[PDB]
Design a binder for this molecule. Sequence first.
Ligand SMILES: CNc1cc(F)cc2c1[nH]c1ncc(C(=O)NCc3cncnc3)cc12
Ligand SMILES: CNc1cc(F)cc2c1[nH]c1ncc(C(=O)NCc3cncnc3)cc12
Ligand SMILES: [K+]
Ligand SMILES: [K+]
Lengths: 372, 372
Amino acid sequence: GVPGQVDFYARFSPSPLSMKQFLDFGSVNACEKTSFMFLRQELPVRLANIMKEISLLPDNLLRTPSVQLVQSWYIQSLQELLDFKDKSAEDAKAIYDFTDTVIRIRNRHNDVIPTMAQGVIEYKESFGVDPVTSQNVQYFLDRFYMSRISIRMLLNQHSLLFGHIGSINPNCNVLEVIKDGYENARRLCDLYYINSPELELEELNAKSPGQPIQVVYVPSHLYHMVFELFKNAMRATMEHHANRGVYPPIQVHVTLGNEDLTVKMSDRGGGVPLRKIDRLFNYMYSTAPRPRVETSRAVPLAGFGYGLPISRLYAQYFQGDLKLYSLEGYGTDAVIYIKALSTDSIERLPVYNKAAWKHYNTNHEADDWCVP
Amino acid sequence: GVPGQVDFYARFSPSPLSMKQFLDFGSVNACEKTSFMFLRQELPVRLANIMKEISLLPDNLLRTPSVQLVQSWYIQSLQELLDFKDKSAEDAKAIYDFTDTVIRIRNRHNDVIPTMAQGVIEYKESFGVDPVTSQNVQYFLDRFYMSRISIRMLLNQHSLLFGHIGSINPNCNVLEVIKDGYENARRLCDLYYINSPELELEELNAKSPGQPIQVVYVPSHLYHMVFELFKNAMRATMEHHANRGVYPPIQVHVTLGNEDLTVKMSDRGGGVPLRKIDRLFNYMYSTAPRPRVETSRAVPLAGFGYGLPISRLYAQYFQGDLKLYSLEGYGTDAVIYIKALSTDSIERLPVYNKAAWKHYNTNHEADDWCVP
Ligand SMILES: CNc1cc(F)cc2c1[nH]c1ncc(C(=O)NCc3cncnc3)cc12
Ligand SMILES: CNc1cc(F)cc2c1[nH]c1ncc(C(=O)NCc3cncnc3)cc12
Ligand SMILES: [K+]
Ligand SMILES: [K+]
């Protein structure tokens, strides 16, 4: 029945699109029939591939009310999409009903990321950290959230085009997005610490010096990354210098190279030893019950969610990256790497196959080197 | 015969030592009998483990005159060590003959690193890059050179103690080593580019502010790392700014934290795109015929050897690291991480076993993600 439908579409691989393909589609032609033909196969494929991995979760995580709800959302969206498998692209009502279904699914899935995060909280609350499964949880959540980002991208594009090119800005003003992230992080910082660091912004357009720095990008993806990084930099700065009462600025250097757009953000917030860096990207370590609604107390800036690992997934989604390197006792740099060329910006998508299944059913240990 | 001896000792795992163990040994007791008992087993074990992996090299690399010579050196040293397997620690002549043999082996192996590098040159000259084997060559050379570093360490300690604690300085003055590396790199830089960048050095002893920064370390290991990094930073700076004729300084920030000693080196040498960073640590990409003897022309600063990957192996040998991160179009940071505590500084050693053998006989590809 439903397992048969999931198995049929999970056999296929997701088909990654480049940023240029996204852009070229909705610019001139903007054919709703073309989007239909692509999505009536691609959305089921992407839903079914990730649904096979939901089923491999540790039972105590799978059985949580929040994961069960997310899975039921995916099952329902998949079934609604499969009703168009045999309908005709020339059937105008079918096209109309499909665009309507895309919008319905988009709203149904609006809360997937925090609901999944709620399931990890429920799991951690009632069973604790399990070192065997916890490697599988980290593997799953990277892939589930990257998958969700890609599905969200497809739904948003179709919804905006048929309900700036979709959510893509062909001329994203990088420094304006950065200032926007700074000001919103600073507002939260003032509310919590009653003070905040200044911003020092430097830019270099090596490609065309003195010219504004723009790229083809999804602005909300860039906003999410820099906003989350600013909150982490500010938290570290405010807590490390609380005794002094003088707070060093946060420095940002933006560079457009022949190939890389890089955003480097630097703080003097006291740093982190190298041994402790990676837990900042670990979902289980970052999982804590969420701030309560019934209080006027300010919300903490960082350490209370998945802002950082999800930021890195945004960077990696279009073949970029997000790296942290810290000098313990001094401060920390974060570097966002983005492809400067739209033709290099290709979706990075997980695929369910024997290799993926093997990851859930194997111990991963470096037995060819001596134990440290 | 000889294959039987190698197989017997390659069954064992190398036994890593901490920096504290190295230091505690040669400080007070300094028992030559104790060193004998340890080394008459540990040296054969470490030689035989790496010799099994020499035999797995691509035939066209194994058969080069330089690799054949290195292998014959290892075979001869192994056989000379095995003559003590049944001799008594109380036999004073046996102790004396063993210390004599350690010194002989140390000198015989003085040229292992450049001779192995000569074999890669010979291999690359006559057969080209082979994409299937080239992954195995990278895997082997990391392990062979890390193994050599560890064997060199044991030979040096025994030779210095029984021929400052050996080559270990319990009070290594980090900034003095750094200035030494700077001045020697600057000398080579002036010879090639007829100019050179200045040094700007900053230090922070977060552990004990204003106090000199010292750690237990092998000074020549630290020298090698910073000297190689300076040469790379200077090369990039001199070539990127050759048009301007004004050369920005190289900035170094040294920090001693509760856990990490970090050395950050920064240049404004124009940077490297992220896609091209890793080839800087790739032996096959870095392999070029060496500068000829018969010339007065200055030797190029970087790009002509294995200084950089071997520097990172030095850092990782005692559980540190060496990382590069660049902003394409602007410049590059290198960060050395060293354990601030001698008890955390444990040898990182390769071990020959089924896992190691499997690496040479498998294709390594990320089939659980879509091809970029
Ligand atoms: C650009 N800045 C930036 C970006 C970012 F994504 C994360 C951080 C960051 N700056 C940070 N400073 C400190 C921490 C931290 O983990 N602090 C806890 C810690 C410290 N010392 C010993 N044990 C634990 C994290 C960040
Ligand atoms: C601390 N500085 C530092 C340390 C280090 F270990 C290595 C480097 C370095 N600075 C560098 N700058 C440039 C390069 C390079 O690979 N240049 C070639 C390149 C550039 N642009 C496009 N394609 C290729 C390498 C380094
Ligand atoms: K599949
Ligand atoms: K072994």
